[PDB]
Amino acid sequence: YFKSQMKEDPDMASAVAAIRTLLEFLKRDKQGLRANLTSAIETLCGVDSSVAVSSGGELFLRFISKCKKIMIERGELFLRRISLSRNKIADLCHTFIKDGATILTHAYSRVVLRVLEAAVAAKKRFSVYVTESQPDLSGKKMAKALCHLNVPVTVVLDAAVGYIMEKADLVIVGAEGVVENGGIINKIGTNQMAVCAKAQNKPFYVVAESFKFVRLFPLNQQDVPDKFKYHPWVDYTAPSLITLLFTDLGVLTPSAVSDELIKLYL
């Protein structure tokens, strides 16, 4: 389709790429537009299998609730809100890091990197531990990106997750999707690390935006859709293993995100 040629900017994610692709292709019409938008969303997720992309596409198409003048104006403002959501999340989350603390991360995440950069701009000293992310090497690239921030970093293997757990002070990771009950959907090496953190009583923090809220209610690891897992690339984390969630709608408890999901009408 066209999402591939907007991948020229590595800073932006795949879901926002699909959102802006839909916005650009919206002004090509020559009601029945709902079917066209649904087919466009389906073609968009047919290339990349991500829950975040589908949730963002649904939330974008949700603004429906010639007469096309009103419809077009919403896309640019929506994109601006997603753009400012990252800064808002970073501002809300940078206050939870103290001097000399140890931070454990799983893989590459632009939100976590922005939060860390805000914390470093707040004149704080900390160390970061990143899992090597064996399936696709992204933890080492995250460490390389953090290297020029003058932040001490160290990459560890995904096998050595419970070995350095006692040396960490808090755990913050991103999320590819927030389910209705309160859990998160992330990389494969997330649930076991959360379990280890819970066993060691270490805090578990999740940072995600408001366009990743999906309406799913899994009960185990096999309840997630098969199209999203594809060696699986995605798992499910129980809401009881998450301490706090930092979004653009404010700090929310795992038991409080359900009300936000319902009010979002997604």
Partner: protein, 316 residues
């Protein structure tokens, strides 16, 4: 009647005289706050509604610093009056000046400009007034002490005293310093003239805080040979009564030498003078804001701490 106090800014001794050629002792910073600011805060917290400040040498600097302080603001409950005179040479001179000027009309407090304390005088003054009224003006001074240990670092050998008091009614009968003294001696008048408590105490820290009487100034002026308060209290008990009080949970000290200055600063850093703490910002100054952290570590704005630096203990 409103409570009044007399503050002697100039320290007539020259203990701090490698450095005082540029700044007075009262303006020396202990924890980035002037000692006179500490004394003014203590006086305001204790309930003083009118403070008299006497300046003798380097009076211009103290006067210009006081006006910038919060105690000189119109919305203050402790009016501060600055009196400058170049003829002062000892505390007795300022007391005679106060007697001649009739500034005081009731019981007042006599403290120095380098006294750091958090003692709230509300019961010692009450009992002093009660025993003054009951006996029809026989008690003239009620000195304030603090119970401590002789081995404490805050008990300097140059400011160590031993007194003999009455257990029944607190009243000082003997006062002497222990500077270079090994075998102290006490007069026989106490034992052979009275009874019912002639105990001797050697666990009192001199806070240099006293509750005076209007006749104290007249007694000072009558004898033109008194310079310091120690001479007055030593000469009064030679013939008027001097009583005493002890605090057990509060803090009080007067900076006199470098050792005691360091001890008082260390005590202040470790929150021994609560609520007078560096992070409390009692001076109401924008440039003295601070945040309290673990291990009594205090950091202000724009600390710009580097990488690898370790703050092992209480650091300001």
């Amino acid at each position: 009647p409103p409570l009044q106090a007399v503050l002697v800014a100039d320290s007539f001794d020259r203990r701090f005289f490698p450095i005082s050629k540029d700044q007075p002792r009262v303006l020396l910073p202990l924890a980035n706050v002037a000692l006179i600011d500490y004394t003014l805060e203590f006086l305001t917290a204790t309930g003083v509604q009118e403070t008299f400040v006497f300046c003798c040498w380097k009076a211009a600097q103290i006067k210009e610093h006081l006006l910038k302080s919060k105690w000189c603001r119109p919305t203050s409950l402790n009016v501060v009056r600055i009196i400058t005179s170049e003829l002062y040479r000892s505390l007795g001179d300022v007391l005679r000046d106060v007697d001649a000027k009739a500034l005081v009309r009731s019981d007042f407090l006599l403290v120095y400009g380098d006294v750091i304390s958090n003692i709230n005088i509300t019961r010692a003054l009450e009992e002093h007034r009660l025993r003054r009224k009951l006996e029809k003006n026989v008690s003239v001074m009620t000195m304030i002490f603090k119970e401590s240990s002789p081995s404490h670092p805050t008990r300097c050998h140059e400011d160590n005293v031993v007194v003999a008091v009455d257990s029944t009614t607190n009243r000082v009968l003997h006062f002497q310093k222990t500077q270079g003294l090994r075998r102290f001696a006490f007069p026989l008048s106490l034992f052979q003239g009275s009874s019912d408590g002639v105990e001797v105490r050697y666990d009192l820290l001199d806070c240099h805080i006293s509750i005076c009487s209007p006749q104290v100034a007249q007694l000072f002026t009558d004898n033109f040979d008194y310079q310091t308060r120690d001479d007055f209290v030593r000469g009064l008990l030679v013939n008027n009564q001097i009583h005493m009080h002890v605090t057990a949970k509060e803090y009080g000290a007067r900076v006199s030498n470098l050792h005691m200055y360091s001890a008082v600063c260390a005590d202040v850093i470790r929150r021994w003078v609560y609520p007078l703490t560096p992070e409390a910002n009692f001076t109401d100054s924008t440039t003295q804001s601070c945040t309290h952290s673990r291990h009594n570590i205090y950091r202000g704005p724009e600390v710009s701490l580097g990488h690898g630096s370790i703050l092992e203990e209480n650091v300001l």
